[PDB]
Amino acid sequence: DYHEDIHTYLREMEVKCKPKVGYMKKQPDITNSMRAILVDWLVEVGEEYKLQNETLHLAVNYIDRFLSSMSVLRGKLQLVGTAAMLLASKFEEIYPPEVAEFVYITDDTYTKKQVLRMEHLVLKVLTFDLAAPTVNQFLTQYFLHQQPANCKVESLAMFLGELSLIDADPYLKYLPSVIAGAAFHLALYTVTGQSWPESLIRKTGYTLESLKPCLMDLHQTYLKAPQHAQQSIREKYKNSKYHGVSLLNPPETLNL
Amino acid sequence: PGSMENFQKVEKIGEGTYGVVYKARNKLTGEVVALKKIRLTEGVPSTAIREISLLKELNHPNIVKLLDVIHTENKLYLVFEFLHQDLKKFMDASALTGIPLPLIKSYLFQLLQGLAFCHSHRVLHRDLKPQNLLINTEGAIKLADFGLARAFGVPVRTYTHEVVTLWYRAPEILLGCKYYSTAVDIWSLGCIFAEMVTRRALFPGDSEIDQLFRIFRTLGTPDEVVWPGVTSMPDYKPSFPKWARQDFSKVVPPLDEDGRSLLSQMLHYDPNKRISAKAALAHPFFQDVTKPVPHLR
Ligand SMILES: NS(=O)(=O)c1cccc(Nc2nc(OCC3CCCCC3)c3nc[nH]c3n2)c1
Ligand SMILES: [Mg+2]
């Protein structure tokens, strides 16, 4: 159903929509850890308002692109994240939370006027280019290649793709299609012992060899997940909605 | 690149999904434009956010061109290429002549091109109706008013239920399917194809049930044969009258064999079997297609 056309188009757009890999080094006042805290909070916001995973992925794309060009003081990072989540929700959700809900969830750190002004600024800086490819949009296509469909594989891949959002180092250097490739293989391997399928080599041009760097990073993230300072994704993926996949044991080795 | 300073307002055109559209002229280049004004509450409306983001990606001869976005803190102005008329008004103006078949064929061909482009760029229009299809004096027709549009995913998840103007709304939406996709836009275009030929709406219902029943009386009440899964759809009722399907030659009598074939594929009940815009471009109906100027204005 236009599946090939759309995949090709997203592969073009993800390159165009990619944040600057090196931006955090060039931010005077904010760090990767502060960004980790922000994204983990957004996961919680997403859970609170029962937002789509897609909405979360979009907001993080908006933040990283915004921070790729705009210097932001630590006390304003949450305002940037908040406006990004409001925009993502308006773009993606059937029923986005009201602006007042977004004001409320900062616990009155910021005013409605500040959130709305930031919304406008984020739109200006991104030149209204909000239809960005996400790890989620690629995963969802890759799932169509399962034989047969496995709910644990799907949810676990989504979980792993979500973990990548937390840590700009290293995941900012990988494209959404590649993170998704690594997440799907790692999930499929964890659950069923199967590997990145031949049909996806044909679709994407990616092999286990080309996915290896991302895979090694993601495997480490997966193994270390229970010890990460940020736990909101692990907690979220305990839910039956995601078939409790965060309780699955990560494979000790990948044998690649 | 623009500023409101170089635009001279000419006249109000109308109100679509949101905002208001004015005809204007760039004083410096002479370009005539359509200006969509948005008063800025809840901040920038989701309809604006979607229309702008998606139209910036959708550059195509049969999609209205968004030229610029002029942003004040109180006002948002969308600068669009100007087209001369809408399809509804043109059909009204053709009351006594009819629309020449070469022009109907050309317009459908162009609409399908424009639509295939949207769908290949993961965009659903969701409000295809003659009022939103704009024509110029050179023979072009273009998709406009992307206020109800959205970026979709592969495969789709559940999107907004309250979509498409009733007369053009697909049976899968009317019956409450959890999933709808690109087939909804084809349904609308199929209704519009028929309307260009008869100059009256194919299915002018005044409620959702009336709409469904008008569709059933024309295409037959769908069973599990024609549309596997119909009977388990959320808003299907076993009490629906079971109308026999009519001879398609009677649905749009001036249409000849090829035209009828195409229309029937655009109005297939099962969204899976309903023809894609991409596939429809190669339909034998279009073997002699050209792009003549409108016969009026
Ligand atoms: N004969 S007329 O008055 O000059 C005339 C008549 C109808 C349409 C136009 N041109 C025109 N209209 C738009 O939106 C009009 C809008 C469409 C949706 C429903 C409400 C009205 C456009 N958006 C980009 N370009 C556009 N061009 C000109
Ligand atoms: Mg820094």
Side-chain angles (χ1 to χ4, degrees), chain A residues 1-46 48-208 210-256, chain B residues 1-161 163-297:
Chain A
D1 340 316
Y2 294 92
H3 279 17
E4 173 177 21
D5 293 337
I6 290 162
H7 174 80
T8 284
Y9 184 61
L10 300 177
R11 283 284 301 265
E12 173 190 3
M13 295 319 279
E14 65 169 359
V15 167
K16 289 190 233 268
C17 296
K18 206 197 169 153
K20 297 214 188 185
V21 177
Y23 87 76
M24 200 59 79
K25 290 144 158 172
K26 307 207 223 139
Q27 288 271 354
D29 202 55
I30 62 169
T31 64
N32 292 322
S33 297
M34 300 180 79
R35 186 193 164 281
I37 289 152
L38 179 66
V39 176
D40 186 84
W41 176 67
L42 294 175
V43 176
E44 295 196 304
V45 173
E48 188 54 48
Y49 294 93
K50 303 150 193 128
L51 303 182
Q52 293 297 313
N53 286 356
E54 179 58 12
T55 298
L56 197 202
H57 283 257
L58 283 171
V60 174
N61 171 268
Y62 301 165
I63 294 158
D64 288 332
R65 283 161 62 203
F66 186 92
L67 299 178
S68 290
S69 73
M70 308 285 280
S71 279
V72 178
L73 296 190
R74 75 191 60 192
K76 293 306 196 295
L77 178 61
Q78 188 176 204
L79 179 61
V80 171
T82 297
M85 197 70 159
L86 169 66
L87 286 170
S89 302
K90 285 175 175 187
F91 181 89
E92 194 53 35
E93 299 282 339
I94 299 161
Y95 317 99
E98 273 180 43
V99 179
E101 298 173 90
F102 286 103
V103 173
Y104 176 79
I105 60 143
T106 65
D107 226 281
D108 307 351
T109 315
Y110 305 113
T111 67
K112 175 157 162 166
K113 279 194 186 164
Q114 275 179 311
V115 175
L116 255 20
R117 285 207 153 161
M118 187 60 81
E119 177 186 69
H120 183 120
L121 183 56
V122 172
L123 288 162
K124 166 179 174 36
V125 166
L126 300 182
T127 53
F128 292 76
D129 300 312
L130 299 201
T134 58
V135 169
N136 180 64
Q137 286 170 61
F138 282 102
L139 278 180
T140 247
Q141 300 171 260
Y142 298 169
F143 292 168
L144 301 187
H145 291 244
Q146 284 172 105
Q147 250 162 42
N150 190 300
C151 283
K152 286 188 258 149
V153 175
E154 290 192 14
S155 288
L156 179 57
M158 296 173 83
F159 164 69
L160 295 165
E162 217 159 296
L163 294 184
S164 79
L165 295 179
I166 298 292
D167 302 308
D169 169 18
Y171 298 103
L172 242 33
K173 66 196 156 138
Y174 302 113
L175 287 172
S177 66
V178 174
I179 294 167
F184 181 60
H185 167 80
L186 188 49
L188 195 69
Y189 188 69
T190 299
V191 179
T192 72
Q194 298 164 143
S195 275
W196 187 246
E198 152 77 16
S199 66
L200 282 172
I201 297 159
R202 285 183 284 130
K203 187 194 185 66
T204 64
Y206 299 152
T207 54
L208 248 12
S210 64
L211 294 176
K212 191 174 193 194
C214 190
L215 220 8
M216 303 282 98
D217 277 332
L218 201 55
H219 186 30
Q220 286 315 125
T221 293
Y222 192 10
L223 287 165
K224 294 174 209 157
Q227 278 69 250
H228 198 290
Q230 279 70 53
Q231 288 293 316
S232 295
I233 299 161
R234 278 192 74 236
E235 302 294 316
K236 166 184 177 182
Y237 281 80
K238 288 183 196 161
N239 200 295
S240 55
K241 197 202 318 284
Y242 312 105
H243 315 85
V245 288
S246 61
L247 303 164
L248 296 171
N249 302 135
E252 299 182 325
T253 67
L254 291 198
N255 340 109
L256 308 164
Chain B
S3 340
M4 286 329 276
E5 178 216 303
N6 303 313
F7 295 107
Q8 173 65 53
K9 256 152 200 165
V10 173
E11 77 213 18
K12 190 207 171 133
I13 299 164
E15 271 171 34
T17 295
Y18 74 103
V20 195
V21 183
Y22 294 85
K23 180 185 184 177
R25 152 183 298 101
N26 184 315
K27 300 151 146 192
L28 285 170
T29 60
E31 179 185 35
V32 176
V33 297
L35 296 178
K36 184 144 136 190
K37 173 217 257 289
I38 299 125
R39 253 158 255 197
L40 302 165
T41 8
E42 290 295 283
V44 178
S46 55
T47 48
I49 281 153
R50 284 172 178 178
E51 174 164 43
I52 302 164
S53 190
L54 305 177
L55 243 19
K56 283 182 97 227
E57 286 184 36
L58 292 177
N59 258 257
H60 185 277
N62 306 111
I63 296 173
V64 71
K65 293 197 199 189
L66 180 70
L67 309 169
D68 208 354
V69 178
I70 294 158
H71 216 176
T72 323
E73 68 166 66
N74 12 49
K75 244 96 76 98
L76 194 50
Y77 287 97
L78 305 201
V79 186
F80 286 101
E81 80 180 295
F82 174 79
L83 282 106
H84 300 269
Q85 191 46 279
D86 70 68
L87 187 63
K88 183 57 170 68
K89 205 5 235 319
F90 185 71
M91 286 187 293
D92 288 346
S94 295
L96 275 154
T97 61
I99 306 176
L101 195 264
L103 194 78
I104 297 176
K105 190 171 290 193
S106 170
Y107 280 176
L108 187 57
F109 193 62
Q110 289 180 71
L111 295 169
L112 290 162
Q113 279 184 64
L115 196 56
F117 196 85
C118 292
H119 291 169
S120 68
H121 294 70
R122 56 84 177 89
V123 173
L124 295 181
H125 184 280
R126 307 188 307 174
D127 202 25
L128 297 173
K129 58 181 181 186
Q131 293 82 5
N132 289 348
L133 305 178
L134 310 183
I135 59 183
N136 69 18
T137 57
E138 286 261 61
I141 188 165
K142 312 195 181 198
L143 304 192
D145 202 349
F146 279 70
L148 242 98
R150 90 124 82 209
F152 66 95
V154 171
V156 295
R157 51 169 223 269
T158 295
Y159 306 127
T160 302
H161 171 66
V163 79
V164 196
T165 294
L166 178 69
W167 290 3
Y168 307 94
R169 179 178 312 155
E172 61 266 34
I173 301 154
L174 290 163
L175 297 168
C177 186
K178 187 175 160 200
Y179 300 131
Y180 66 77
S181 53
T182 53
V184 308
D185 285 336
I186 286 292
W187 182 270
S188 307
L189 278 200
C191 295
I192 290 159
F193 180 16
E195 200 172 330
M196 283 191 280
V197 188
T198 62
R199 262 157 289 121
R200 59 203 222 177
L202 186 56
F203 298 133
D206 35 63
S207 70
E208 291 178 56
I209 196 71
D210 187 52
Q211 191 66 26
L212 278 162
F213 285 177
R214 287 170 173 275
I215 291 155
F216 296 172
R217 287 193 289 267
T218 300
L219 302 177
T221 298
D223 56 26
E224 291 283 334
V225 185
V226 59
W227 189 358
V230 245
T231 64
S232 307
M233 293 181 79
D235 294 309
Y236 175 89
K237 325 273 134 76
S239 64
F240 286 168
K242 268 74 207 174
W243 281 284
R245 171 172 185 95
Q246 256 182 19
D247 169 13
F248 236 65
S249 62
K250 304 293 162 273
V251 176
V252 186
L255 237 34
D256 294 324
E257 209 184 337
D258 289 332
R260 288 196 305 273
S261 166
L262 178 53
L263 183 63
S264 66
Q265 290 170 251
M266 294 174 78
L267 301 175
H268 208 85
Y269 273 117
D270 192 338
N272 187 19
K273 295 219 217 189
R274 194 172 311 146
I275 197 175
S276 76
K278 178 193 291 194
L281 294 175
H283 195 284
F285 184 60
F286 299 114
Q287 57 188 283
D288 54 345
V289 72
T290 58
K291 177 177 159 211
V293 165
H295 68 307
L296 302 163
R297 240 175 294 147

